[PDB]
Amino acid sequence: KLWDSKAQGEQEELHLLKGSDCNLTIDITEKCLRLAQRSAYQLHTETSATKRIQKFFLLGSLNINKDDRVIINIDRFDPGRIISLHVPTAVIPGDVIIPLSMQLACLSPFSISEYYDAFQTLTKNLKLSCDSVDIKDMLSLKIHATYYVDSDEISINVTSGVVVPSALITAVPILPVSIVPTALARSLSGPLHLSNFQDTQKSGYVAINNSHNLLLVLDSDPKLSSIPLVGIWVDGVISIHHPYVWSACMRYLYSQRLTNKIRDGSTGFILVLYTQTRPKPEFWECSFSGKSDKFLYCQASDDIFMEKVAKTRNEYMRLQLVPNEFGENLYFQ
């Protein structure tokens, strides 16, 4: 009886890769691959404690550009630090962390056990994170590189694998619900929420009082651990199809830092959506009922051939990943 759940429009199915036709695009610059191979080759030769498979990091950025199409732009190599754990040199906010394994070819593939362990790590972060909603937390990307050096060229086989939670969020438009006019609620409905900038998303959580009115809460409020929560609010997107909205829903469903979620995926929870294109927020009832630990995954690979002498160009390599429940890349060129 907290709100009316009668559907006021078509159901929508939300997922990270919905807008991109289930396609994940990876762009990798030749320069960072050249630095990765250069660093790897020195260790394997002029150094003796080199493990046969070197462990490095590539650093990328997550961009969303045409109808919510997600692209990872990988352009930085990072050997990483040892602390006993292997971590990047300096983690920048907005960095996609891609573990890079490479080995000199002599005399490679992703297995489901490797995908499974990556997804366990992914969901453990979703359950335990205390940070703001981040789309980068919704995918785990890895690269295997096999390289060879001869007198003529450097050759590299680059294989990339990803795991993404498969959960679909069912979203139903509902009638508007009264919001207590706190300062946060007033600033979200105010004139400043009308902009046109990319990656200006923010989100929080929705509490409820004795009068069954909604209270908006910042994502950093320490009371979130036990305040009774009924859903989320999202600001700075054009529509509900933005993958950030699904990311906030997933984060709310998975988080074990929120111990008093009296409305969740089984009962349906509320989304107060402040879009950038409308003066008033949209109200949705979101639900999830499928398998919680199911994931999509697949791999893609391509060869690159590099001259010994580097050319000051911006050459890059594009990989297309359309993962599914069965591990098949459903991309056809």
Author numbering: 13 to 95, 103 to 126, 132 to 357
Quote the authors verbatim.
Here we demonstrate that CEP85 is essential for faithful centriole duplication through a direct interaction with the previously uncharacterised N-terminal domain of STIL, a key factor involved in the early steps of centriole formation. Subsequently, through its C-terminal PB3, PLK4 interacts with STIL and phosphorylates it, enabling STIL to recruit SASS6 to the site of procentriole assembly.
The NTD of STIL revealed a global structural similarity to the N-terminal domain of the autophagy-related protein ATG7, a protein–protein interaction domain that forms binary complexes with Atg10 and Atg356. The common structural core of both subdomains consists of a six-stranded open β-barrel capped at the top and on one side with α-helices, a fold that resembles the so-called MPN/JAB1/PAD-1/JAMM domain, as observed, for example, in eIF3f. The STIL NTD subdomain 1 is structurally more akin to MPN domains than the subdomain 2 and this similarity extends to the position and length of the capping helix and the presence of a crossover hairpin-loop, connecting strands 4 and 7. Interestingly, we found that these capping helices and their vicinity in both STIL NTD subdomains define the most conserved patches on their surface making them prime candidates for a role in protein–protein interactions, in this instance binding to CEP85 cc4. The structure of the STIL NTD showed the presence of two conserved patches on its surface. Thus, it is possible that the STIL NTD binds other factors, as yet undiscovered, that might compete or synergise with CEP85 binding or be involved in CEP85 independent functions.
